[PDB]
Amino acid sequence: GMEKKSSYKTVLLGESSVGKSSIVLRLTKDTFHENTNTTIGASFCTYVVNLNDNYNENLCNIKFDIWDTAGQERYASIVPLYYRGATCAIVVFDISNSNTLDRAKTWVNQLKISSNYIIILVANKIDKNFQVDILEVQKYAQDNNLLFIQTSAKTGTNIKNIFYMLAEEIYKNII
Amino acid sequence: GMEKKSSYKTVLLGESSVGKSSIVLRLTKDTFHENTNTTIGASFCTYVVNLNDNYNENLCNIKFDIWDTAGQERYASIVPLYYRGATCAIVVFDISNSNTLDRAKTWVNQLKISSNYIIILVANKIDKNFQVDILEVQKYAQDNNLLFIQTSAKTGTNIKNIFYMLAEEIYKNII
Numbered sequence: 181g182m183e184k185k186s187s188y189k190t191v192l193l194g195e196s197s198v199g200k201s202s203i204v205l206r207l208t209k210d211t212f213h214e215n216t217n218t219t220i221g222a223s224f225c226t227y228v229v230n231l232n233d234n235y236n237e238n239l240c241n242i243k244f245d246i247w248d249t250a251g252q253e254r255y256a257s258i259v260p261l262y263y264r265g266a267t268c269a270i271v272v273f274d275i276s277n278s279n280t281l282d283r284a285k286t287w288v289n290q291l292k293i294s295s296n297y298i299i300i301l302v303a304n305k306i307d308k309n310f311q312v313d314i315l316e317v318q319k320y321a322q323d324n325n326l327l328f329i330q331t332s333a334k335t336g337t338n339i340k341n342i343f344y345m346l347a348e349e350i351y352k353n354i355i
Numbered sequence: 356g357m358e359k360k361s362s363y364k365t366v367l368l369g370e371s372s373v374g375k376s377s378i379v380l381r382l383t384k385d386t387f388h389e390n391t392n393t394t395i396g397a398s399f400c401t402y403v404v405n406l407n408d409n410y411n412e413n414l415c416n417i418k419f420d421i422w423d424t425a426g427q428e429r430y431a432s433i434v435p436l437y438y439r440g441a442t443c444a445i446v447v448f449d450i451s452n453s454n455t456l457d458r459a460k461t462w463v464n465q466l467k468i469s470s471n472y473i474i475i476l477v478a479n480k481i482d483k484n485f486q487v488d489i490l491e492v493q494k495y496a497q498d499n500n501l502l503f504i505q506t507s508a509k510t511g512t513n514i515k516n517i518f519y520m521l522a523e524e525i526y527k528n529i530i
């Protein structure tokens with residue numbers, strides 16, 4: 181790779197409650213819900229980043245096809261359907277719950293073996309007052325050659341930037 | 356469409372017992388098992404058709420990424436993972452079991468609404484001595500603008516031809 185595509189399959193992965201549905205809602209509808217429900221059925225959405233909005237107009241309109249595992253990450257025989265053929269993996273944890281970091285690390289290791297993914301590790305819920313050490317997390321991401329970003333779905337902080345960073349990386353690769 | 360791709364996601368769909376795992380085994384390993392087991396985990400395989408083996412060498416090497424639903428077609432919240440982003444759908448029934456035809460028709464209707472698929476309706480098990488009327492089935496496929504083929508995983512009849520027909524259709528579209 182990288183072959184240029186009409187859209188880029190992107191797995192949105194993380195333990196329940198870390199804020200995946202909230203990242204999608206904030207991203208796509210500029211809205212946040214303090215209370216959320218369990219997902220009914222498969223969870224998909226699309227999002228377009230145009231990098232010029234120095235980039236080649238043909239390559240730099242990047243469309244994400246986001247698959248939110250939304251609970252299916254529990255099932256070892258179902259989750260590969262989310263990974264297969266994905267260009268990007270967004271692995272989310274909650275800064276206030278260290279257990280969710282531990283699971284994210286396990287997923288990063290699985291993904292690195294599975295295929296070549298552009299992986300972004302997302303520290304969500306930074307608006308809250310930390311069970312993790314961010315510096316350790318940043319070091320972790322460097323050691324594993326991951327993109328890293330700190331976000332709040334609640335305030336909107338760095339939500340679009342998740343996909344800006346991914347799109348920059350896809351372009352760099354296509355180029 | 357059609358955008359040229361490094362591989363073409365292909366959903367292999369049909370009621371249990373119609374012969375999906377057998378089509379894959381015959382296709383990929385030139386082998387048939389008279390007895391088969393329930394599938395453990397997600398079921399994927401790849402297959403390449405080279406159309407020159409009058410065609411443009413760049414476009415005519417067609418790689419299929421085959422996702423066998425392998426039992427998951429029962430689950431309405433799981434099956435969309437198989438359909439989403441698929442270029443082709445292979446909908447298989449068993450000529451000796453009309454119930455499997457009725458289900459295949461329901462799936463064709465769902466797929467036609469879901470997205471633009473190249474759909475091939477496969478009449479498997481033709482080696483057996485028919486609960487269906489082939490002419491009705493051929494008429495059905497014409498009315499719904501489907502590719503149609505009669506196959507035996509047991510003897511190997513027309514198994515490779517499923518993918519020859521699909522590859523011809525993908526090329527026609529890319530062109």
Ligand SMILES: Nc1nc2c(ncn2[C@@H]2O[C@H](COP(=O)(O)OP(=O)(O)O)[C@@H](O)[C@H]2O)c(=O)[nH]1
Pocket residue numbers: 194195196197198199200201202203213214215216217250304305306307308331332333334335
């Ligand atoms: N304070 C805060 N709460 C959040 C944030 N993102 C999600 N939540 C809350 O966390 C809970 C779980 O969110 P949800 O989107 O359902 O997580 P998912 O299971 O990973 O999809 C909900 O109560 C959300 O309102 C955030 O960035 N900050």
Ligand SMILES: Nc1nc2c(ncn2[C@@H]2O[C@H](COP(=O)(O)OP(=O)(O)O)[C@@H](O)[C@H]2O)c(=O)[nH]1
Pocket residue numbers: 369370371372373374375376377378388389390391392425479480481482483506507508509510
């Ligand atoms: N006679 C005959 N038997 C077949 C054929 N294809 C599959 N079978 C048998 O049908 C049964 C179900 O096959 P399988 O591949 O497991 O079907 P699946 O559930 O759709 O994946 C097995 O006993 C196979 O040996 C065929 O073309 N002819």
Ligand SMILES: [Cl-]
Pocket residue numbers: none
């Ligand atoms: Cl909160």
Ligand SMILES: [Cl-]
Pocket residue numbers: 201213215216217218
């Ligand atoms: Cl909700």
Ligand SMILES: [Cl-]
Pocket residue numbers: none
């Ligand atoms: Cl038989």
Ligand SMILES: [Cl-]
Pocket residue numbers: 376388390391392393
């Ligand atoms: Cl088997």
